[PDB]
Design an enzyme around this catalytic site. Structure first.
Site, PDB file in Angstrom:
ATOM      1  N   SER A 145       0.815  -1.210   0.000  1.00 48.59           N
ATOM      2  CA  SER A 145       0.000   0.000   0.000  1.00 48.59           C
ATOM      3  C   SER A 145       0.854   1.266   0.000  1.00 48.59           C
ATOM      4  O   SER A 145       1.771   1.386  -0.819  1.00 48.59           O
ATOM      5  CB  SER A 145      -0.952  -0.001   1.203  1.00 48.59           C
ATOM      6  OG  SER A 145      -2.141   0.649   0.831  1.00 48.59           O
ATOM      7  N   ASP A 202      -8.356  -4.757  -6.796  1.00 49.87           N
ATOM      8  CA  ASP A 202      -7.651  -3.688  -6.067  1.00 49.87           C
ATOM      9  C   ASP A 202      -7.568  -2.417  -6.884  1.00 49.87           C
ATOM     10  O   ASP A 202      -7.189  -2.447  -8.065  1.00 49.87           O
ATOM     11  CB  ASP A 202      -6.220  -4.156  -5.779  1.00 49.87           C
ATOM     12  CG  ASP A 202      -5.480  -3.272  -4.793  1.00 49.87           C
ATOM     13  OD1 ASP A 202      -6.061  -2.270  -4.312  1.00 49.87           O
ATOM     14  OD2 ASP A 202      -4.300  -3.608  -4.498  1.00 49.87           O
ATOM     15  N   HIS A 255      -7.242  -5.674  -1.940  1.00 46.50           N
ATOM     16  CA  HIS A 255      -6.071  -4.983  -1.428  1.00 46.50           C
ATOM     17  C   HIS A 255      -5.488  -5.648  -0.213  1.00 46.50           C
ATOM     18  O   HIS A 255      -4.239  -5.793  -0.101  1.00 46.50           O
ATOM     19  CB  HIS A 255      -6.387  -3.537  -1.126  1.00 46.50           C
ATOM     20  CG  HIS A 255      -5.159  -2.647  -1.006  1.00 46.50           C
ATOM     21  ND1 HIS A 255      -4.239  -2.539  -1.991  1.00 46.50           N
ATOM     22  CD2 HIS A 255      -4.727  -1.815   0.032  1.00 46.50           C
ATOM     23  CE1 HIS A 255      -3.274  -1.669  -1.604  1.00 46.50           C
ATOM     24  NE2 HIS A 255      -3.584  -1.218  -0.375  1.00 46.50           N
TER      25      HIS A 255
END
Ligand SMILES: *[C@@H]1O[C@H](CO)[C@@H](O[C@@H]2O[C@H](CO)[C@@H](O)[C@H](O)[C@H]2NC(C)=O)[C@H](O)[C@H]1NC(C)=O
Ligand SMILES: *[C@H]1O[C@H](CO)[C@@H](O)[C@H](O)[C@@H]1O
Length: 278
Positions: A145, A202, A255
């Site tokens: 991330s 994602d 994610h």
């Protein structure tokens, strides 16, 4: 160069047990981590800093397969679908510490560079401590991330500025970080060291958008369907055949999903992290 590769997807060449492992090493940055002696896959947690409130947690591990491994948490110190006018999203020159090493006109996103900069002296110090201490020349940088973009910059820094350079980097849910100049420079300094892993639907790999002047380096491996083990490699920068060809979902589900049998579930997932658990 600034473009979008049209090339056909190939079989996934990446070492999946190493991807699995790195995922574990980064999930763990979401948990408290001077739990001393901790063990994740083949790895021993050696050291930790930050806490995911003012800076990202960074864990230093030692690993027979990945060397000294630097993992950078990507919790939401700031938000990537907030107002794209904010200073956080502006391009800026490299920090003075390492601008001397980059082509002229390299731009990097502020939010990521500032956040790496508040950690970079400590990371370097710690990486040198534990290289010397474990007679280890391989340095692996991992992030997820927000930590993925920081990890890219860190991985570049280590390659350019640290003696011995970089072994590899594994980068999960990598947001964009730099302009086309930055992305091409990555390709040439660490192209063959670079591993960007995207899961399912994602959305994070799509921000900040290209309209603002941002460009991914070359290649990612895209795991579709989400959490499965099918994955092709989509080569060159910003490959037209890749992730956009399937609706993005606008939550963190994929994610925070399963990356070759290891879940990077973030704040709400496994602590401690469990390599291969799924
Ligand atoms: C892949 O794995 C993740 C979790 O590892 C699944 O996401 C969960 O989905 C439900 C709603 O869809 C949420 O309430 C949970 O919070 C999610 N978990 C996390 C950690 O975010 C995900 O949906 C799976 N994906 C696919 C395609 O099957
Ligand atoms: C996709 O198409 C482009 C131009 O449209 C080629 O240059 C590329 O090699 C691929 O076949």
């Amino acid at each position: 160069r600034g473009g979008s590769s049209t090339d056909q997807p190939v079989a996934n060449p990446y070492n999946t047990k190493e991807i699995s492992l790195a995922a574990g090493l980064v999930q763990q940055t979401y948990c408290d981590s001077t739990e001393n002696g901790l063990k994740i896959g083949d790895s021993e947690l050696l050291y930790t800093m930050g806490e995911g409130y003012a800076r990202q947690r960074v864990n230093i591990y030692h690993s027979p397969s990945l060397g000294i491994a630097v993992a950078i948490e990507g919790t939401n110190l700031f938000s990537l679908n907030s107002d794209l006018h904010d200073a956080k999203f502006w391009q800026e020159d490299p920090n003075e510490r390492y601008i001397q090493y980059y082509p002229k006109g390299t731009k990097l996103m502020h939010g990521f560079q500032q956040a790496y900069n508040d950690l970079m002296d400590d990371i370097f110090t710690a990486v040198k401590k534990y290289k010397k201490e474990k007679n280890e020349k391989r340095v692996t940088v991992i992030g997820h991330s927000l930590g993925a973009a920081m990890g890219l910059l860190c991985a570049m820094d280590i390659e350019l500025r640290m003696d011995g350079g970089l072994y590899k980097t594994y980068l999960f849910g990598l947001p964009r970080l730099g302009n086309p100049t930055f992305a091409s420079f990555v390709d040439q300094k660490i192209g063959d060291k670079f591993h960007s892993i995207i899961n399912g639907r994602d959305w994070v790999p799509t921000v900040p958008p290209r309209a603002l002047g941002y460009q991914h380096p070359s290649d990612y491996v895209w795991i579709y369907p989400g959490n499965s083990t099918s994955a092709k490699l989509y080569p060159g920068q910003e490959n037209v055949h890749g992730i956009l060809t399937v609706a993005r979902e606008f939550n963190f589900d994929d994610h925070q999903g399963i990356y070759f049998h290891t879940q990077i579930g973030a704040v709400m997932g496994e602590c401690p992290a469990q390599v291969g658990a799924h």
